[PDB]
Amino acid sequence: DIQMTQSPSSLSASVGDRVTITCRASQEISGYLTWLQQKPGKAPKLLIYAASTLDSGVPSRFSGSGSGTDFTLTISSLQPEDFATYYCLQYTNYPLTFGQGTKLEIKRTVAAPSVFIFPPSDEQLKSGTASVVCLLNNFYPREAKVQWKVDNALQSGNSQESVTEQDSKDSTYSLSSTLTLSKADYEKHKVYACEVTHQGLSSPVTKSFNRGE
Amino acid sequence: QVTLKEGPVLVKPTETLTLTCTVSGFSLTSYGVHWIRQPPGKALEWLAVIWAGGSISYSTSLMSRLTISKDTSKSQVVLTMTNMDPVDTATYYCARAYGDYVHYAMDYWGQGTLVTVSSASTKGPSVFPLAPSSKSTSGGTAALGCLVKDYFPEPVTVSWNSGALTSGVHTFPAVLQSSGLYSLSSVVTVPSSSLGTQTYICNVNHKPSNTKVDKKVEPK
């Protein structure tokens, strides 16, 4: 199999920057080289084929060069909607083989999260479980710390987090943290709080509620 | 319109996957069709191709397990994969090869079919409201949502007010709990002034169990 070595594997750049992704084939592949762009959750999109032919409708800021074994994708004047994983693909011989991808993240200014907390619903409690949700909305960068306190006692091993992909317009992230307790545990204690630490917050933000209030 | 349409499927281990790629806007006697898969978090992997004249090529490591068929009258290409293993869990794509077998461009792709290989049984989701309160009210904006808990396999799709509500919607990637069941949440930020007058309904579709749930999020 023809090995395609793609570099870098992850890259962060600002809007308007020029970015460069390289791809090296282990054998001569002439110009049978394609660049793909894949947004999270979606099918890959064709950017360039025959190493340097821009597919119709693709913005002119995308460009491909090279022939033989060394190939380059250039994105001039990066735009927020260009966050994606990019792949090169050779098709001179079977099996077709891909580079292992380049994840392109968009750099922007620090944005502190707005924090919200949701008690468990009466419907969920009726089934005997209690999930408490803490929401961090529209922040940057991705790094954030969410600590759960029940009656001021630090929780561990009973919460899970999930983060969205970068927004296509403002390049921010959102995050949920879910604390799941037994119904009996939830009904014993009163004060539930999530404390959020983030680079955009001069001091940690705590959102809390008192059960049944 | 040139389209390639492939639903999500659970396959038990050692059993057989059948994927259908139904094409429109072009003839299967003029274009080839490629099959490509992508495990969660990993790179694309090429599987097979059937050319317009019927020639076929398979990934060498998987050739014994793969077969392709074509039905031109139905505009369908069918990929069969036997002896499925949990490492075969992936999103499977079909894609058109515009050109010939030598020079071509993979210009149009199917939406992709999430295939899960697991001995676990299908389960529909429970949908719970994340109610807006003073605890979810920043200034003039309120946050609300839906908790979609305990389903298998992936995926679920979530919309709000039948697609009318899109701005400020965040549907998070699903989390796998130790039980082997998935959970996710979908949230939206709205004007607090609207809580008493505007209806907010999350529309949850879990095709693998044919489950559809509409849950209104009542203000507290």
Residue numbers in the entry:
A (entry chain L): 1 to 213
B (entry chain H): 1 to 6, 8 to 82, 82A, 82B, 82C, 83 to 100, 100A, 100B, ...
Please give sentences taken from the publication describing this entry.
Here, we describe the humanization of the pan-HLA-DR mAb 44H10, a murine antibody displaying significant involvement of the framework region in antigen binding. Murine mAb 44H10 was shown to target an epitope on the HLA-DR molecule conserved in humans, suggesting its potential clinical benefit across populations irrespective of HLA haplotype. Using a structure-guided approach, we identify and restore framework residues that directly interact with the antigen or indirectly modulate antigen binding by shaping the antibody paratope and engineer a humanized antibody with affinity, biophysical profile, and molecular binding basis comparable to that of the parental 44H10 mAb. Here, we describe the structure-guided humanization of mAb 44H10, leveraging CDR grafting methodologies further guided by critical insights derived from the structural characterization of both the parental antibody and intermediate humanized candidates.
As none of the nine initial candidates displayed significant reactivity to the BJAB cells, an additional nine candidates were generated by grafting the slightly longer Kabat-defined 44H10 CDRs onto previously selected frameworks in a second round of humanization (V10–V18). While none of these additional candidates displayed reactivity to BJAB cells comparable to parental 44H10, one candidate (V17) displayed superior binding relative to the others. The binding of V17 to BJAB cells was further characterized using a full antibody titration, where a greater than 50-fold difference in binding EC50 between parental 44H10 and V17 was measured. In biolayer interferometry (BLI) binding assays, parental 44H10 displayed an apparent affinity of 1.5 nM for recombinant HLA-DR, whereas V17 did not produce a measurable binding signal at the concentrations tested. Thus, conventional CDR grafting methods using two distinct CDR definitions generated a humanized candidate with only modest HLA-DR reactivity, displaying reduced affinity to the antigen relative to parental 44H10. In particular, K60 and R66 in this region contributed the light chain’s greatest per-residue BSAs and mediated several direct contacts with the HLA-DR heterodimer. L-K60 and L-R66 found in parental 44H10 were changed to serine and glycine in V17, respectively. The crystal structure of the unliganded V17 Fab solved to a 1.95 Å resolution highlighted how the shorter side chains could not replicate these binding interactions mediated by the parental mAb to HLA-DR.
